[model samples]
Target: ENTPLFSPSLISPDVLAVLPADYTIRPLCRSDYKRGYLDVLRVLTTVGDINEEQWNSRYEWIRARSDEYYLLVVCDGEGRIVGTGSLVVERKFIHSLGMVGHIEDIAVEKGQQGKKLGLRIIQALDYVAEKVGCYKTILDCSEANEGFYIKCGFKRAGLEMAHYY
Candidate 1:
């Protein structure tokens, strides 16, 4: 029970109310590929590491390896792209366990960073997971972001692994 997920308090109703009704969240389309891909790289780039070509390639891969269950959260208001996130359902087997919902690559517009919009987008993804009968939802973030996920109701699991090379 040490995998952090978001909770309600991380967001205020007032903040949610600020979201325009016309703004809708849905699965991303091919037309959204460039912008959505750039958005993720933009967030990661703020901390300084990823290359543009690599991110673009990954975007192409996401489009090519389309998973029927994958979903993306998008904000389209006034005909402009604003925010997005990606979710996938994976089946893991360990002594008779089953599929789990994995929430990954969550990003909100730079200007929309702290208003709990990301949290709201995540909650919406959870709703989708629940509808699909997922056994659990999971994700990982940097130690720097542990508190944010903890407030969202996710608990610590253990050390995670990563490789840059």
Candidate 2:
């Protein structure tokens, strides 16, 4: 049975209360490319904007895998994207055939750092993971941001190893 893990209707009053009155969190849309790219690039400097053709192809690819990927954004009253986070749920062949929720690319505007926007994004992903029956939700972050994640209720379970070219 195909079922949604999380829907905009699932956002509760309590969650809404915590968010700023002028901000709204929702899934990223095709028209948000320019604003979203700028928002993400402000925090993730290594990423670069792609050509229109590449963007269209990538957008289509993401849409094709909509069930497995959720790219979310928090926008201001004027509809400018200020923060973003992606929740990717992957199917597994092991561990009771459960799914895993991996959160990535969490970013908030520079001036918006201390406003708890990051916490809301993480909470949103966590809620979806729980509703979708994920075995667990996990994320990788730099040591400097570990405390922030801890504050968001994530524990340092194991070391994150990576390979660089």
Candidate 3:
């Protein structure tokens, strides 16, 4: 294999099982630039024009931290990346040098909304946080997505959404 952003072993089978029969979720891959990976991110935020060379450079930047990042992508039956998310595990001196997973950069294509793709994405990240021994996982968002994360097993923790499953 050329290389995946992270190991496929980090993906949760149960989460994948909940997807539509026409969909598949897995670790990000190098070839994803051609698979509509950045297009999916544009759903979450503005992504500038990025070429394949830039994609590889950034991919390698993140791959340098392979032990910390667990980025994932969701592809449709046609093999285009329709969704993407991330679980970045951070090491801390607090909680006895415990680890905390930060869920970020989640986005599903506009046409692919309402399919519970975001729900399963969070669940998959939660599995990685727990499996990697993170004490808790956290993310920040506006009120619009507050309800969505609550549905994703996130709880209100003052000013942020946190998950401890």
| Candidate of highest TM-score | 3
Residues 55-160 of candidate 3 have per-residue lDDT tens digits of 8898888888878988998889998999999989999999999999999999999999998988988999999999989999999888998999999989988775
Per-residue lDDT over 7-106 for candidate 1, one digit per residue giving the tens place of the 0 to 100 score: 3332334435656676655555544544444555466446355476765565566656544245454465653456665568776675276667777777
RMSD of each: 8.3, 3.9, 4.4
Backbone Cα, N, C clashes tallied per candidate: 9, 0, 0
Q: Against the true structure, what is each candidate's TM-score? A: 0.67, 0.88, 0.93
User: Tens digits of per-residue lDDT for model 2 on 1-165?
Assistant: 113223665443455677998888876666677665554656865677577678767877887787788877888788788888888998998889999999988999887778998999899888877777899999998899999999999999898998989
Error of 3 at 84 (Å): 0.5
After superposition, which runs of candidate 1 have C-alpha atoms over 4 Å from their true positions?
Answer: 1-19, 34-37, 45-69, 95-97
Model 2 ranges off by over 4 Å: 1-7, 10-13
Model 1, residue 87: displacement in angstroms? 1.4
- Each prediction's Cα lDDT score? 0.60, 0.78, 0.89
Q: What is the Cα-based lDDT of residue 147 in candidate 2?
A: 97
> Which of 2 and 3 is the better model by lDDT?
3
Model 3 TM-score on a 0 to 1 scale: 0.93
